[PDB]
Design a protein around this nucleic acid. Structure first.
Ligand SMILES: [Mg+2]
Ligand SMILES: [Mg+2]
Ligand SMILES: [Mg+2]
Ligand SMILES: [Mg+2]
Ligand SMILES: [Mg+2]
Ligand SMILES: [Mg+2]
Ligand SMILES: [Mg+2]
Ligand SMILES: [Mg+2]
Ligand SMILES: [Mg+2]
Ligand SMILES: [Mg+2]
Ligand SMILES: [Mg+2]
Ligand SMILES: [Mg+2]
Ligand SMILES: [Mg+2]
Ligand SMILES: [Mg+2]
Ligand SMILES: [Mg+2]
Ligand SMILES: [Mg+2]
Ligand SMILES: [Mg+2]
Ligand SMILES: [Mg+2]
Ligand SMILES: [Mg+2]
Ligand SMILES: [Mg+2]
Ligand SMILES: [Mg+2]
Lengths: 155, 130, 219
RNA sequence: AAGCGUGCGUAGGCGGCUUAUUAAGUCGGAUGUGAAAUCCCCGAGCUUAACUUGGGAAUUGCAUUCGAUACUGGUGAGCUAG
RNA sequence: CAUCUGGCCUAAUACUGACGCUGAGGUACGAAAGCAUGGGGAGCAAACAGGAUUAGAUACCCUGGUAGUCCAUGCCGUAAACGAUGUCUACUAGCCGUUGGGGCCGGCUUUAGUGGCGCAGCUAACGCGAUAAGUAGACCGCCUGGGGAGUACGGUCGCAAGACUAAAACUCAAAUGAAUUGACGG
């Protein structure tokens, strides 16, 4: 279960005599075969917040059916003001994607994909959108299952 | 006034599927019935029944669910009265790489995109269903 | 199916507070009162009540939730008359989710209820002894029927889908199974073995509880 | 940042249902055309490479002609949910 | 209160047979203030005058007070003219009020309005939620960082006050929305 720390920010809160500082971290975990999850942590120091985030990320994991090591079809997804588009590529390309997206793609076992973010590039909302896009992508088996056909009769 | 009557059928169906209705009933016409039969063959709905009253006919579709989700996930009008589509034969659109159908009107009737690439034709693109 | 129509489960609530999502199991409104469907109650109560024995066979216990003040004094009895856990004072937010939190309270309570009546706690003041007694008694108020658990349950059995939401939500969070007597004024939303019935009556609640304890008795 | 203060209306755009016909949009085939160079692909000369060069592919545009009629348009005949 | 007059709702029965929707230009109407001619003028009251308060007080407060507010006949064409939400059509859980009708046995149901809650969905959030900001279709209007500037010049309109149409050089790296934790409030 390989772990990928995506973002680490320092946030402040006003009190009567000055500022109280703290840290948030956003991390991704996955194995490399179709299971990935993401989480967030908060703490007064950076390693403590990272630990908290990783523990919150080891739940909220999902499973995703994928054609070899690329997507089954093109995916549109969004969370809040962030939009992500993903396309299956053919072997020999890498993950052509930017930052927050890769960690969700690389940690689930995707090796060839064309990906592009529109809208806001907030890392947390981008990771949320990509997660939602992989969670609701379907394979050629569930489609024929729910339609009363076989995998051959459809394509 | 209502001016697209096929988009109205697709909207009635889309709304019923997310209100979890069992059947949906609309006014009927030859093109609506043809499209619903293409939906039935592909396995997206269960049953299609038309019934005439004295002069006007009403059409009743019976929907499908699976794992507590509706079977029609996406249904989209493509060629509206404000912009008609008319693809050729190399340019027929493939919906979700082939895990969905595209309803096409050609001079041999209404069919799906994969069924018209075989015949070597293709006219107006009615809708995408995935 | 006649004992179903016998205990008082015929009537539901009044025809203004009905969660609209429970109409597939509604019959009519007599004197402005909706009635459950016995065909949908007695033929589903048994489909749910098979699972209690089919689980106790492997011997994994099930928690029992009732606190609505009209079925707490029946849940006190009919739940420890079958050798299982119980909770009948309040849902005590975050027990099935922060179990590692309430565990220390349960340990301190077992130590204060095990070393105060069998360990000869002497050489102390009477006022302090009475204070510690009242403290462990209030600690037993909402932890006593769930003392010898040490593990997370395998399924819950509720008496009001409405009044026990902090429990059903926690169950769905932790992925456990849940069975409840959802009435007409209650949403059948996430209780996974749903049984209709008049949750507000002493008789119907007690008859369902007796059937549950008997189902778990064939162990 | 962005619904005219509100109507009514001209050009325009878009328009219910059934049927017969037409074949303009739409779709298919065939024929002529789309200079060479350039871009791309095999491979040949330069010691290699730039570079030069053989053959292809492409130039999916245009026009002419023969067909197909589901949809949109035209024409005739019907209907009553607007 | 009389006279003249427009629309809406509601029930049957009959009739016509797509006669429709939207609309660039164009026209009609359009609060208050203001203008023109002729009247009227109780109360109120821009301007103005005096009395206070004040460091000062061209203000707030007090005593007065003319335009104006009213009528007749015309002009102006603008407002936070706001639901800050174009018009038209269809569809999608429920519960509680209220106005005008129809039906039925105080209550039920239906139809056109007008309010409060609220599932799904939607939204940056706040919120909206059959009177949508949900799901869709038809046509129109408008937006493209802040200032300069809704201004200059040219034109049209107006008695004028002005309205409408509508830039640029130059300058800056922000300006803005919604929510959060403090602090502060005559
Ligand atoms: Mg604004
Ligand atoms: Mg308006
Ligand atoms: Mg016209
Ligand atoms: Mg026309
Ligand atoms: Mg032709
Ligand atoms: Mg050439
Ligand atoms: Mg006609
Ligand atoms: Mg009248
Ligand atoms: Mg006639
Ligand atoms: Mg109009
Ligand atoms: Mg205009
Ligand atoms: Mg005065
Ligand atoms: Mg204005
Ligand atoms: Mg405005
Ligand atoms: Mg009402
Ligand atoms: Mg009424
Ligand atoms: Mg509300
Ligand atoms: Mg809307
Ligand atoms: Mg909005
Ligand atoms: Mg001006
Ligand atoms: Mg504040």
């Amino acid at each position: 279960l390989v772990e990928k720390l995506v973002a680490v920010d320092r946030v402040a809160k006003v009190v009567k005599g000055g500022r109280i500082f703290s840290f948030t971290a956003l991390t991704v975990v996955g194995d490399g075969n179709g299971r990935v999850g993401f989480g967030r942590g908060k703490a007064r120091e950076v390693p403590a917040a990272i630990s908290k985030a990783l523990e919150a990320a080891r739940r909220n994991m999902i499973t995703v059916d994928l054609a070899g090591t690329t997507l089954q079809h093109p995916v549109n997804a969004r969370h809040g003001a962030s939009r992500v588009y993903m396309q299956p590529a053919s072997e020999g390309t890498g993950v052509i994607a930017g930052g927050a997206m890769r960690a969700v793609l690389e940690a689930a076992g995707v090796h060839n994909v064309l990906a592009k973010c529109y809208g806001s590039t907030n890392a947390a909302n981008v990771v949320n959108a990509t997660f939602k896009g992989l969670r609701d992508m379907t394979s050629p088996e569930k489609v024929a299952a729910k339609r009363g056909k076989s995998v051959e009769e459809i394509q | 006034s209502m001016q697209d009557t096929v988009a109205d059928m697709l909207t009635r169906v889309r709304n019923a599927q997310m209100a979890k209705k069992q059947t949906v009933s609309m006014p009927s016409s030859k093109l609506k019935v043809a499209i619903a039969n293409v939906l039935q063959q592909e396995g997206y709905i269960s049953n299609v029944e038309v019934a005439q009253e004295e002069t006007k006919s009403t059409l009743t579709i019976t929907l499908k669910y699976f794992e507590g989700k509706p079977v029609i996930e996406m249904v989209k009008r493509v060629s509206r009265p404000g912009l008609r589509q008319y693809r050729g034969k190399d340019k027929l659109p493939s919906v979700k790489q082939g895990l969905g159908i595209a309803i096409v009107s050609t001079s041999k009737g209404i069919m799906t995109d994969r069924a018209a690439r075989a015949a070597g034709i293709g006219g107006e693109v009615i809708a995408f269903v995935s | 199916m006649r004992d179903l129509l016998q205990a008082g489960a015929h009537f539901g609530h009044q025809t203004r507070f009905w969660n609209p999502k429970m109409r597939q199991y509604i019959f009519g409104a007599r004197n402005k009162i909706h009635i459950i469907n016995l065909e949908h109650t007695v033929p589903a109560l048994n489909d749910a009540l098979n699972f209690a024995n089919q689980l106790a066979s492997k011997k994994n216990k099930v928690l029992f939730v009732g606190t609505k003040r009209a079925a707490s004094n029946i849940i006190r009895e009919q739940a420890q008359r079958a050798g299982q856990p119980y909770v009948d004072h309040r849902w005590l937010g975050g027990m099935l989710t922060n179990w590692k939190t309430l565990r220390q309270s349960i340990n301190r309570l077992k130590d204060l209820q095990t070393q105060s009546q069998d360990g000869t706690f002497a050489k102390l003041t009477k006022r302090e002894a009475l204070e510690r007694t009242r403290e462990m008694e209030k600690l037993e108020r909402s932890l006593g029927g769930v003392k010898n658990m040490g593990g997370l349950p395998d399924a819950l059995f509720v008496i009001d889908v409405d009044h026990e939401a902090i429990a059903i939500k926690e169950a769905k969070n932790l992925g456990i199974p849940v069975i409840g007597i959802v009435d007409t004024n209650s949403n059948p939303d996430n209780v996974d073995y749903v049984i209709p019935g008049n949750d507000d009556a002493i008789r119907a609640v007690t008859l369902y509880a007796s059937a549950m304890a008997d189902a778990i008795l064939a162990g």
